Amino acid sequence: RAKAKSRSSRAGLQFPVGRVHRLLRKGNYAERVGAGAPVYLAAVLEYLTAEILELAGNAARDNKKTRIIPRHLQLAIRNDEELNKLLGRVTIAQGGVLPNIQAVLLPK
Amino acid sequence: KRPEGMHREVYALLYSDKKKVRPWKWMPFTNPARKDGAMFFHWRRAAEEGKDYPFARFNKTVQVPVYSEQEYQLYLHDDAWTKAETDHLFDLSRRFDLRFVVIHDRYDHQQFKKRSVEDLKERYYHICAKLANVRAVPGTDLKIPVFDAGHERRRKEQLERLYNRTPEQVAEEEYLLQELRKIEARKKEREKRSQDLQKLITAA
Amino acid sequence: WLSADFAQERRWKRGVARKVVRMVIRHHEEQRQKEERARREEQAKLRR
Amino acid sequence: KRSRKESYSVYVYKVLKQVHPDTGISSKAMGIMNSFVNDIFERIAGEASRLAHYNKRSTITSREIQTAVRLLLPGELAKHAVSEGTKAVTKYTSSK
Amino acid sequence: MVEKKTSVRSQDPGQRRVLDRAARQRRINRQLEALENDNFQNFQALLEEQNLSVAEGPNYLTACAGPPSRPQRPFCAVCGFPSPYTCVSCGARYCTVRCLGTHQETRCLKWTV
Amino acid sequence: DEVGALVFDIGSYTVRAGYAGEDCPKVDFPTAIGMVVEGPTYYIDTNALRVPRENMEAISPLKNGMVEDWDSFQAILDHTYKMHVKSEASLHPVLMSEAPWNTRAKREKLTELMFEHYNIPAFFLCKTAVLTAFANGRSTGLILDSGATHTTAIPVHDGYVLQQGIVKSPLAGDFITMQCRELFQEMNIELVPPYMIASKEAVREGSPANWKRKEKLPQVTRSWHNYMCNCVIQDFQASVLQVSDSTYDEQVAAQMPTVHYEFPNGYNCDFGAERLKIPEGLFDPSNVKGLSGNTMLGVSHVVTTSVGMCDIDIRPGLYGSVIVAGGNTLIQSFTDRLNRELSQKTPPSMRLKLIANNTTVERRFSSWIGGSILASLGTFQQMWISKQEYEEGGKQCVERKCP
Amino acid sequence: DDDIAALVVDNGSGMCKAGFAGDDAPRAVFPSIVGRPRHSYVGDEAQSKRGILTLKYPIEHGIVTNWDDMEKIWHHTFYNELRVAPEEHPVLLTEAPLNPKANREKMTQIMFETFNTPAMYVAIQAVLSLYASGRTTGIVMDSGDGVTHTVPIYEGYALPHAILRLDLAGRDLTDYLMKILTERGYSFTTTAEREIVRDIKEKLCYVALDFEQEMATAASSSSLEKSYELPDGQVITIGNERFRCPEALFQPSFLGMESCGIHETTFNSIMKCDVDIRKDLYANTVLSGGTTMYPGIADRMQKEITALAPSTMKIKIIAPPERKYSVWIGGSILASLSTFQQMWISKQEYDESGPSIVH
Numbered sequence A: 001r002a003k004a005k006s007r008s009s010r011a012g013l014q015f016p017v018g019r020v021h022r023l024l025r026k027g028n029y030a031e032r033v034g035a036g037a038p039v040y041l042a043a044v045l046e047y048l049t050a051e052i053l054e055l056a057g058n059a060a061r062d063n064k065k066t067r068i069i070p071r072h073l074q075l076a077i078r079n080d081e082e083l084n085k086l087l088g089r090v091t092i093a094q095g096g097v098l099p100n101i102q103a104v105l106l107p108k
Numbered sequence B: 001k002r003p004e005g006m007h008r009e010v011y012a013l014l015y016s017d018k019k020k021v022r023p024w025k026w027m028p029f030t031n032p033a034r035k036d037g038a039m040f041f042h043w044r045r046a047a048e049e050g051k052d053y054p055f056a057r058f059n060k061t062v063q064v065p066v067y068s069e070q071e072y073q074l075y076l077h078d079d080a081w082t083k084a085e086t087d088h089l090f091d092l093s094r095r096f097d098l099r100f101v102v103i104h105d106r107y108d109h110q111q112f113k114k115r116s117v118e119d120l121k122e123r124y125y126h127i128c129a130k131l132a133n134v135r136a137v138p139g140t141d142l143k144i145p146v147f148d149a150g151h152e153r154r155r156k157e158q159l160e161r162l163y164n165r166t167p168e169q170v171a172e173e174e175y176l177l178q179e180l181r182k183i184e185a186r187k188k189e190r191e192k193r194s195q196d197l198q199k200l201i202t203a204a
Numbered sequence C: 001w002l003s004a005d006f007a008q009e010r011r012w013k014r015g016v017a018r019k020v021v022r023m024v025i026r027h028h029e030e031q032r033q034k035e036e037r038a039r040r041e042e043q044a045k046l047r048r
Numbered sequence D: 001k002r003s004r005k006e007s008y009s010v011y012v013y014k015v016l017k018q019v020h021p022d023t024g025i026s027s028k029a030m031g032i033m034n035s036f037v038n039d040i041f042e043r044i045a046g047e048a049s050r051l052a053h054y055n056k057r058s059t060i061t062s063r064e065i066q067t068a069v070r071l072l073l074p075g076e077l078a079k080h081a082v083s084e085g086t087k088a089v090t091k092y093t094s095s096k
Numbered sequence E: 001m002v003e004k005k006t007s008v009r010s011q012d013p014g015q016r017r018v019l020d021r022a023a024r025q026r027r028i029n030r031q032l033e034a035l036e037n038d039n040f041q042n043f044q045a046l047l048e049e050q051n052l053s054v055a056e057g058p059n060y061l062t063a064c065a066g067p068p069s070r071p072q073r074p075f076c077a078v079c080g081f082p083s084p085y086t087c088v089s090c091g092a093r094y095c096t097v098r099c100l101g102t103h104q105e106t107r108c109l110k111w112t113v
Numbered sequence F: 001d002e003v004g005a006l007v008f009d010i011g012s013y014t015v016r017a018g019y020a021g022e023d024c025p026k027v028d029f030p031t032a033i034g035m036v037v038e039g040p041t042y043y044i045d046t047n048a049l050r051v052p053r054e055n056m057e058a059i060s061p062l063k064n065g066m067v068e069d070w071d072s073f074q075a076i077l078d079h080t081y082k083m084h085v086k087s088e089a090s091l092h093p094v095l096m097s098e099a100p101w102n103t104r105a106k107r108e109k110l111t112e113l114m115f116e117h118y119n120i121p122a123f124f125l126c127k128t129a130v131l132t133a134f135a136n137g138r139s140t141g142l143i144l145d146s147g148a149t150h151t152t153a154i155p156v157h158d159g160y161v162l163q164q165g166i167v168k169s170p171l172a173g174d175f176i177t178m179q180c181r182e183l184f185q186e187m188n189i190e191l192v193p194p195y196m197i198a199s200k201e202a203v204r205e206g207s208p209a210n211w212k213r214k215e216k217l218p219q220v221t222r223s224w225h226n227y228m229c230n231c232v233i234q235d236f237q238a239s240v241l242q243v244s245d246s247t248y249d250e251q252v253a254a255q256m257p258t259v260h261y262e263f264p265n266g267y268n269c270d271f272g273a274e275r276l277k278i279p280e281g282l283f284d285p286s287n288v289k290g291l292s293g294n295t296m297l298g299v300s301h302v303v304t305t306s307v308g309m310c311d312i313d314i315r316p317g318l319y320g321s322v323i324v325a326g327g328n329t330l331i332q333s334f335t336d337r338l339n340r341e342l343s344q345k346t347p348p349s350m351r352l353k354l355i356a357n358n359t360t361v362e363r364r365f366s367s368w369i370g371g372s373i374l375a376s377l378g379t380f381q382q383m384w385i386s387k388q389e390y391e392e393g394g395k396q397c398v399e400r401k402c403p
Numbered sequence G: 001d002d003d004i005a006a007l008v009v010d011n012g013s014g015m016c017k018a019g020f021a022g023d024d025a026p027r028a029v030f031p032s033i034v035g036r037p038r039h040s041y042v043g044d045e046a047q048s049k050r051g052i053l054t055l056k057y058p059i060e061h062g063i064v065t066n067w068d069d070m071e072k073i074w075h076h077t078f079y080n081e082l083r084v085a086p087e088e089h090p091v092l093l094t095e096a097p098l099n100p101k102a103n104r105e106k107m108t109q110i111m112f113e114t115f116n117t118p119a120m121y122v123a124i125q126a127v128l129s130l131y132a133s134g135r136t137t138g139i140v141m142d143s144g145d146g147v148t149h150t151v152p153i154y155e156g157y158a159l160p161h162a163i164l165r166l167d168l169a170g171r172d173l174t175d176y177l178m179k180i181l182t183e184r185g186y187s188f189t190t191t192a193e194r195e196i197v198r199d200i201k202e203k204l205c206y207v208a209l210d211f212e213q214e215m216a217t218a219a220s221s222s223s224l225e226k227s228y229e230l231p232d233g234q235v236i237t238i239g240n241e242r243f244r245c246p247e248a249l250f251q252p253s254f255l256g257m258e259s260c261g262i263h264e265t266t267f268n269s270i271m272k273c274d275v276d277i278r279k280d281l282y283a284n285t286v287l288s289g290g291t292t293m294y295p296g297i298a299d300r301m302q303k304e305i306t307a308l309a310p311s312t313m314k315i316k317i318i319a320p321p322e323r324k325y326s327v328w329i330g331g332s333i334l335a336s337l338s339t340f341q342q343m344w345i346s347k348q349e350y351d352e353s354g355p356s357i358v359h
C-alpha cells in the first residue's frame, strides 16, 4: 500500500505521538481518546524538554563543559523563573543547589 | 453565530480558548576526464548546456611508478624476474589500482611462472623501492617498510591450519580453552598454595 | 548509494501501485454507496 | 528472553542535537530528560482526564489537552506550549 | 510535499530571552581578539612575556595612544557600508531591512555562548 | 549520468533487454529461439515460436553460456533491436552481460560485430557476477548463480571476478528437466505439449486425459517438440518441486504433503515424495540414479569449494556476502536448505550471510538489473569502450579495457 | 482542484478518445491523422482531403513522431473540448505499451515547456483500463487499431517481464477483410472504402463462438448473410466473411501471419507470470479496446483458453460491455480521483530535476 507516514512526522514532532497516544490508549486516563490529544501532549512535552535542555546546555557552557550533567539541570531549572515553578516540587538527582549565600551571613 | 468554517479540531482549539521557460534538452557533452574525446549525451537543463562534466573530478588515478628501460636495466634487474615478467605486474597494478588480491588471479601463468600473492607483492614493492632509490637524494623518504613477505608468508599460513578444522581444534579445543584457565589457576592454586600452607604450618 | 536508491524507488512504486488499487477499490465501492445513498434518501423522503 | 524497556532517549537527542548541534548529553542527564517527559505527560494527561470527566465526557480530547496545558504550564510556558501544539494540529490536519 | 522544517524547529522564539549589555561587550571583545587572532580559524607565551613587561616607564603597555578625538563612525558589517541603524538586541549596526534580515538569521544572538 | 543506453542480459534460457535505470527489463524472451533454413528465418516472441510449423530447428545459439552460432546471435539482437526496443543502435550505448568463463576470442568477436554490424556509439561487456553484485548493492561477495545450464559460484572481490575461485557444476535447470523427464516416464505420465490440444474434458485423479488433437498439425521436428515439452516441464518445476529443508529422508518425504498438478491435455494427479527427491540431486548428487560419480559438486559444495579456492583473507568477506541468483533458486526451500548446509559447513571463524533477495525478477535478472544500475552512474560514463577506442585500437580494445 | 479539472487524452489511431474527464465517454474524438501537401488538418478534414493531401499516422504500433505530429494532436485536442487550457490544464496523456524512458522525457518536456501544464501523470493504457475494471489484477488485452496487447497487470503494475504483444487488431484485420472481399465483387477498392471496412464490424462480427459454426453454416447458408449499407446505396449480403476476418484474432495463420491468436498470446503471457499470482490472472481476465466489441470473441476468450488452461482454475471473463472505452473510463477514474493529487508531477520538481524525473 501507500508508504506509511508516522504521526510525529505529519504533525512535525520529535516525541513519539504513537507511543504517547499509546500510553494513553491503554492508560485508562480516559475512556475513548480522540485524534488530537496525543499530538498536543507530545508537542508540549517535547517543548518543555527543549525549553529546559536550552538552559541546561547554556549553564553547562558557563561551566566550560560539553556534557550536560544533572548539575546543569538543577542550576537551570532553578535559574529560570517559570521552569522552577513548574518543577518546584521536583528534586533532580545529582544536580546540587545554587550558591545562594544569605547577605547577613557574610564578612562585615 | 459561530464563525467556524475550518477543521473541527483546529477550529475548536483556536476559538474555544480565545511559466517555467527553462527548457531541458537532450544534449551532447564531452567528459574532460577522458582522453578519447568520446561524445556522450545527457539530460541537462537549458541554463547549463555547455558546462564541464561534474563527475570528472572522481578520477584520482592511483599512483604507480613508471621505471624506464635504462633505469630498470641498472637497478631493477632481478635474476628471478625478467623485464617481460616485470612490466606485466605493473600493468596489472595500474589496471587494478594497485590491489593485489585481484592482480594475482589475472596473472599470465602461460608465459609466466606461478607466483603467490606475497612474492608478487614483494616484487612490486622492491621495484617501487628501487625506483624511488634512483631518486633517493631528492628527499625520497628512503624509510619505506616494504611489505614483509617472510613473516607474512607464515602469517597467511598459520591462519590456514586454524581455518579448516572440522571439529576438535574448532570443537575439542574448547576443552584446552577451558584448560587455559585451569592451567592458569590450579598450578598456582597448587604449588603456591602448598608453599603458603607449609609456611602457615611452620608458624603453627 | 544508488542501489539503496533503486531499492527504495522500487519498493515505493510497488506500494504506490497497491494503494492506487486500494484507492480505486474504495472509489468503486463508493460508486455503490452512491446507490445506497439514493435508496437511503428515498427512505428519508418516506419519513419526510 | 530479552526484557526490553522503553524510554524517550531517541527523541530527546533529536531535539537536543537540533537545538544544540555541538552539545552532547550524558547518559545520567538523559535519564533526567526522560523522567521529565514522563512526568509532564502524566500531568497534562491527568488534567485533561479530569477536564473531560468534569463535563461528563468519556473521551480526553486535544481541546481538553489545550485547556490542561493552560492550567498546568505557567503564563509564558503555557503560551508557548499552547501555540506550538495549536500550530502542530493545523499542520497535521492539512495533510502535510 | 511538506514544508520540511517543523521537524527541526530550531529557534521557536517563544522564550527568546535577549542577550544584552555586558554580553554585547563580550561579543565586541571576541570580535576584536578574532581580528587580532592568528592562522587557525605562541600567544600564551606572548601574554606571559608581556606580563613580565608591566611597568610605569616607557614600554609596550604605556605606548598605547588611547581613545580618538574623531568620534566612531557607523558601518553595516554585512556589506560594510555606512549604517544608520543599530540592532536592538546585540547593538551591531546595519543599513537596510534586508541586512537586518540576514543579521537576525545568522549573527543576532546565535554566537554569544 | 544516465543516458539513453541499452542493457542486454543474454542468459542461456532467456534474454532480457531494456534501458538504463529501469527497475525491470523492457522485454524478456526465450534464448532458445526458433529457426527454419529458408537465408534462415527466426522466431522469438513465444507467439510465433509456439506455432507448430512445417519445418523447425529450435537452434539455441549458445554453448555452455558462450556464443557459438554468431548468425543466430546476430538475428536475436536484430529482432530485439527492432521488435521491443525499436531504436537505432547507432544512437544508444550498449551494456551487455557475459559468462565469467567466456574466452577472449568471443569478447573480441562480439566487440567488432557490435561496432561493425550495429554501428553503436559505445560498448561495455561485463560479467554476470559483477552485474549481480551491483544489483545487490555490494562491491564484494560470493555470487552464486543456479541457471538453466550450469550452477556456478563466482567470487567478486572489490568489483573484480576471481577466475581461480570459479566453480561450476552441470546440476542446473536442464538437469532438473532431465530428472522430470525420467520421473514422468517412471510414472507413465502422458506428457502432451500445449500446442496439440483442440479441446478437452475433466478426468479423475490419476486417470488418463480426455482430449482431442488438432487436425491441422504439420510434421514438426524432434528438437522443437523437445523444446515445447521442456517448457511444460519447467512449468512443472515452478508448480510442484520443493527442496527438502534438510537432507532428503524417505520417511519424512513420505510424511510431507502432496501437491496436485495437471498437464495441458487434462491428465492430473498428486505428486508426493518424488517432488522432493528430484531437487535433492542439486545438493547431494550421490543419490541420483544414472548420474553416479563423486566428481559432481552440489550447490552448497559448489559454494564452499569456490570460497575455499580464494585467499583466506577474503574468505570472510565472501562468506559474509553470499549473493544468490539464478532461476533454479526460486524452488521452494532452496535458499533455506542452502543456508542450513552452509551454516553447517562454513568454518566457525567466519560470519555467514546470504543477501535476502527473493523476487523472480531479482533472482533471475540480477545481471540485467546490475546493467541497469551500472549504466546510471557518472563514474561509469568514463569506462565506456567508445567507437573511437574500436577504430583506433581495434577489436582487442575489450581486452585492454574493463575486465 | 486538479481532479475536478482533470483532462484525459488518448490518440486512438482508429479513433481518438479524449476530453475533460470524469464521465464515462470521451468528449473529443477525431481520427488522429496529420495531412500535408502532396506537391495541417487533423479533425475530420484530412479524411475528406485524403485525395489531395499526404496523410501520415502519428502512430507506429507503440511509437510516435513525438515533436511535430504529437504537439499538433494535443493542440487540436484542446479545440475538441471545453478549451479550458488557459484557465486549467492538469493532464494525463497518450502512452505506449512499452516505451516509458524513451517517451516520457521528450513527452513531458514538450508538455511542461510548450503546454505549461501545472500537473502531469502518465501510465500504461492497460493500467488505466484496470481502474474501469474495478479490480486489482488482470490480463487486460488493451486492444485497438494499432496494437494487440496481452499485458498481465498485477496489483496495479504492468510487469514488463510477462508483457507480450501481438499485431492483429486494426489495420491488419481491416486489410485482411478488404482482401477477403474483392473475391465477391463487394468493391472495397480504396482507402475511402477501407475507412468503412473498419465499420462493417459494427454489425457483422458473429454473435457467438464460431469456429465450428462457420463450417456448419457454409454448406446450407440462409437468412444469416446480413446486408450492409454501402455509400453507393447498395445493400449486398455478406458471405462467409461473416467469420473470415474475426477468425484471425484467434488463427493469425488464417490471415497469413505466422502466429497463434489472442487466446494463445494471453495464455503465454500469463504463463510467463508467477505461478501463484497467475491464479488471479485466471480469476481476472479482461478485455478492452474497440476490436473487443465483437460478441463472439468473448466466447473465444472463454473456450479457446479453457482448452489450454488446467481444469482447476476457471475463466472469469469480466469484459465490460463498453470495452471500446474502458481505457478512457479507467484513466478518467484515475485522473478524477479526490486523493490522487499526491501522485501528480508538477512544475517545481520538473524544474528542479528535469524531464528525467521518476514520473
Ligand SMILES: Nc1ncnc2c1ncn2[C@@H]1O[C@H](COP(=O)(O)OP(=O)(O)OP(=O)(O)O)[C@@H](O)[C@H]1O
Residues within 6 Å of the ligand: F010, F011, F012, F013, F014, F065, F128, F145, F146, F147, F148, F149, F150, F172, F173, F174, F176, F177, F234, F237, F238, F239, F325, F326, F327, F328, F329, F330, F331, F363, F364, F365, G275
Ligand atoms: N519459478 C520457478 N521456480 C523454479 N524453478 C524455476 C522457475 N523459473 C525458472 N526455473 C528454473 O530456472 C531455469 C532458468 O534459470 P534462469 O532463467 O535464471 O537462467 P539463465 O538466466 O538463462 O542462466 P545463465 O545466465 O546462467 O545462462 C529454468 O530452466 C528452470 O529450471
Ligand SMILES: Nc1ncnc2c1ncn2[C@@H]1O[C@H](COP(=O)(O)OP(=O)(O)OP(=O)(O)O)[C@@H](O)[C@H]1O
Residues within 6 Å of the ligand: G011, G012, G013, G014, G015, G016, G017, G059, G143, G144, G145, G146, G147, G169, G170, G171, G173, G174, G198, G201, G202, G289, G290, G291, G292, G293, G294, G324
Ligand atoms: N463500433 C465498433 N464496433 C466494433 N468494432 C469496432 C468498432 N469501432 C472500432 N472497432 C474495431 O476496433 C478498432 C479500433 O478500436 P479503438 O477505437 O478502441 O482503437 P484506437 O484507440 O483507435 O487504437 P490504438 O489504441 O491502437 O491507438 C477498429 O479498427 C475496429 O477493428
